[PDB]
Amino acid sequence: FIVEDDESLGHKELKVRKGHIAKLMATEYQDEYTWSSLLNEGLVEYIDAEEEESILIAMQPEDLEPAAKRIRATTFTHCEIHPSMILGVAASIIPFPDHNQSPRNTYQSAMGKQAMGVFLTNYNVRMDTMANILYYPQKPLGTTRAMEYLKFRELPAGQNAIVAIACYSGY
Amino acid sequence: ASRHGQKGTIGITYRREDMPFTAEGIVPDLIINPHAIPSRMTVAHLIECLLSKVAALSGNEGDASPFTDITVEGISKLLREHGYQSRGFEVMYNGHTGKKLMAQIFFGPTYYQRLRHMVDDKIHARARGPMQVLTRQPVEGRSRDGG
Amino acid sequence: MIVPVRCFSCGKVVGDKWESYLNLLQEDELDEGTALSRLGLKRYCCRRMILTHVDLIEKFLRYNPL
């Protein structure tokens, strides 16, 4: 996001406003703003890996813009569109990756690729050497907003079960 | 495996008649060792379980959203108002006798996925099979019935 | 794929209600909560399935094989 230091309304503000996002929602639900159409009029700007050494970033769109759960300058130029987007494909599946040890997240990221489920829909027609398809895939009850864009909810991996954490004496 | 690197395998299988059972008559799908929790130190798994329970109760599907304001306290309050123990602990009965279990057990729904390593593909034995041509030793490979 | 039959945990027959469950969310614009509650699923074991089921035969069948 590009942030204009100047503001007639006062202190500082990122240029985009509510009208633009309303137009975006309207365009989407029509089933004519595109991401490109956001680019042209100067609302978001691409940043290569080199520039960051000359830019200050605001994590939240409200972190310091104006004047128990958890722990939370005035010269920002760009604000992150959303922090949860620093992940990749596989890690996006992990629910609450913040709330566990990082190597455990790495273990899961590597392992999830070794899970069955569905891989396409034409498989009844598509020959192949190897193929796994399970009976009753279920979209997990827990989920993040991301994998909706990953079409994951459409093509789930496993199915949830009623687990119990106990030592029932044998195995 | 879970969604948190907590891999594992099946040891044995019981059926309902002797599996531990709750007051409402629900019986668990599978049970894991509590000791697997602290050493690996995966906490988010438990939050997933609790949130999944409350989501199933309300019917409204839950959220993960790595960096957001959702905390455990709201989950506990909502689950409690739905009429269960706030932290998810549950009275539990022993199928063999029906007696009360002295402790309580954390217990709810959780997502799993099946892995690629079925035992049948990995069992292999050999006794006086084919020999290798060059060196007269047993051949290589399970598929080729090697040693 | 076809909605499962005979809920895993408990065993109550599920699937007969599935098509009823769909129209409850179409012309009655209720929530899934009240939908199932009127549908009559006290235990959540019978209920997790209806929540998380993903139809795929809908996508499959709309091919044109032969």
């Binding site: 639900y29 909706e148 | 409350v54 409204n60 959220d63 905390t71 709201g74 309050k77 909502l78 | -």
Partner: peptide, 20 residues
């Protein structure tokens, strides 16, 4: 104190459709 524990896609779809 829900703090938005849940999100619905079809409900938001219908709400913004009637909003339009």
């Amino acid at each position: 104190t829900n703090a938005s524990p849940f999100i619905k896609r079809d409900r938001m779809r219908r709400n913004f459709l009637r909003m339009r």
